[PDB]
Design a protein around this ligand. Structure first.
Ligand SMILES: Cc1cc2nc3c(=O)[nH]c(=O)nc-3n(C[C@H](O)[C@H](O)[C@H](O)COP(=O)(O)O)c2cc1C
Ligand SMILES: Cc1cc2nc3c(=O)[nH]c(=O)nc-3n(C[C@H](O)[C@H](O)[C@H](O)COP(=O)(O)O)c2cc1C
Lengths: 350, 349
């Protein structure tokens, strides 16, 4: 299965370094691709021409295939009244840092479904792989990418979501287990979250004998990779393992957090961004259902509010509101140059 | 690795999970005779009934087997809380022409509150004694080990695993979020880390000392191989054995697990008073919803639910049943237990 997948992508090793918005960089992606895996960058939140520049930066650092990731959520629905109430609720937190909340919130992460400039840019630049999170694009768009040689991956958290990935015509499904760090790939969180663990999810999707399955969530070493392959996966995707790499853009506080005792426990929160996401809990991790908490605005408007608070806190040296995403294998994190980490994972896999 | 197999004197690193209401002496004996470790659960029975169940297993196998006991913090009776809960359930009872019970009972005595259990186990000396929801005091673990019993305790986190090591147990059963039935969380009031099997097993094997038994979501030899790659010394499988004819799952449960409902499991605290995974039905609702009163302690809640199940059953209604199943439920197979064990071994090899 790994022979099939590595051949499908242009690569030597069945290991994808996860795209991680705010953490992956062209340097990180190129290091992993150079070492033989599939490096990744995340381009959502940037204008298409900035995305183009980022893709070109990676190409200036590696000749090998890499992965470009875009969010494909339902386009956020602005709700000024609900957003106003949310900001008013956050007011005392801003005031701790001598700040006021932003006067309005913005749709800071445009979905692939709402920014028509993204697809033609990708068709021009032709990265080896394009991946989607939160949903699959229409079949005709997936086809357009494939027509110029691009391999298309989509994340799914359930067999039902995997069926939609299949119907979209993707080349592979990234099976994201509950272990995974960062945003959950749930398509329609208003319907709930089955919260299936990696070991069950990968086996269920592989037992379907359709798309190659890339296991994502909680994998930190070659033993984890071997286990994923035993379950039927064709490859793995690893985020938390690469966060401490010097090539990533994690800041010092994030690295310190992930190296220390806080790594012993991760949690899910919707109050950071408006969508369920896993990280090291802090003051942004509260109960949205608690008395006094007004209704949550839509994703990604909530994250715009949180980013403003993060900025105010950071300006006073306070890191207690940071987005420090991490999977349930966080305590097994290592700090190595990314090429060395890739090499080490391959040795462990053998 | 032969770390677990040599510890228990068995041929195969596979435990058929103890499953209160589903495992039987016949199931345990079939699995043990086939070379694995069969298990029974004896909580909810008087010690002498537990003794009888242990003797039933011995009548059917000369091989090692596992006897499981709940080790939760003893439930505290609270008549006012229980009356409020019964009142909330009242319309459900009325739907079936029944009255709710007047009082709730502590139907599942913890190992910590029934002092007749330890002496009985010391006399009967099963090969393994296992504990769910907590570890007994070190002195009691030692008492069992002193007569040659291997002691297993379930843990859902590295912090709970540390308590298992502190208690001096022989092995830790790492229960991932995939697992069917009751979650082994020691102190649910502190929250639930809800760690998946793949992370949990690796964490315990990479950072701890004890042999790790992987539990949750494992349905075939590929799953067993995956667990061993993560560093487990054995596996424990519940859902996989539910459909065996030797189990005491009723027909509705068997048909539910075989049919389309197997595509979704969920956790509920409203069935028993403790978080547990199964095929969702009318007993699966949000305990934090508007108008829902505070939950009585475990296991008093389950006594209430059993009464409702009885009433619904009398009218041919199965929508309140406890049909526990793990997240690998869609991969369940229906075979004689010894034949399933043989198949798993072939798949493992
Ligand atoms: C800090 C961080 C950032 C992430 N950013 C993205 C992202 O921008 N887009 C995306 O599709 N997935 C993102 N992910 C999720 C990964 O693709 C993958 O599901 C996850 O990293 C696997 O879990 P692991 O961290 O245990 O390896 C991110 C994960 C983390 C920890
Ligand atoms: C119907 C059912 C009943 C169970 N009963 C018990 C029990 O009585 N005592 C216990 O310690 N574990 C019990 N378990 C949990 C198992 O020990 C084990 O954690 C779980 O079955 C593993 O998940 P799996 O069903 O995916 O194999 C039960 C599980 C199920 C599905």
């Amino acid at each position: 299965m790994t022979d099939r997948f590595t051949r499908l992508l242009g690569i030597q090793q069945p290991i994808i370094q996860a795209p991680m918005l705010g953490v992956s960089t062209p340097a990180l992606a190129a290091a992993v691709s150079n070492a033989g895996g599939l490096g990744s960058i995340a381009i959502t939140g940037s204008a298409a021409e900035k995305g183009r520049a980022l893709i070109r930066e990676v190409r200036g650092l590696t000749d090998k295939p890499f992965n470009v990731n875009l969010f494909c959520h339902r386009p956020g629905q602005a709700d000024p009244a609900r957003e106003r109430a949310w900001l008013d609720y956050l007011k005392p937190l801003f005031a701790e840092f001598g700040a006021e909340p932003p006067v309005r919130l913005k749709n800071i992460y445009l979905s692939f479904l709402e920014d028509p400039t993204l697809l033609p840019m990708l068709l021009e630049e032709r990265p080896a792989a394009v991946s989607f999170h939160f949903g699959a694009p229409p079949r005709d768009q997936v086809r357009a990418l494939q027509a110029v040689g691009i391999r298309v991956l989509v994340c799914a958290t359930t067999p039902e979501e995997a069926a939609l990935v299949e119907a979209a015509g993707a080349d592979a499904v990234v099976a994201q287990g509950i272990e995974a760090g960062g945003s959950r790939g749930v398509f329609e969180p208003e319907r709930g979250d089955a919260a299936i663990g990696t070991l069950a999810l990968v086996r269920l999707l592989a037992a379907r004998g359709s798309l190659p399955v890339v296991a994502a969530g909680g994998i930190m070493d070659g033993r984890g990779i071997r286990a994923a392959l035993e379950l039927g996966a064709s490859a793995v995707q690893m985020g938390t393992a690469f966060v401490l790499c010097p090539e990533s853009s994690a800041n010092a506080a994030y690295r310190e957090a992930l190296k220390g005792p806080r790594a012993a426990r991760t949690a899910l929160t919707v109050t950071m961004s408006g969508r369920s996401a896993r990280g090291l809990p802090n003051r942004m991790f509260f109960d949205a259902a608690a008395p006094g908490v007004p209704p949550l605005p839509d994703y990604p408007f909530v994250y715009d509010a949180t980013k403003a608070l993060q900025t105010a806190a950071l300006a006073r040296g306070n890191h207690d509101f940071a987005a420090q995403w991490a999977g349930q294998g966080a305590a097994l994190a290592r700090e190595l140059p990314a090429a060395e980490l890739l090499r080490t994972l391959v040795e462990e896999l053998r």
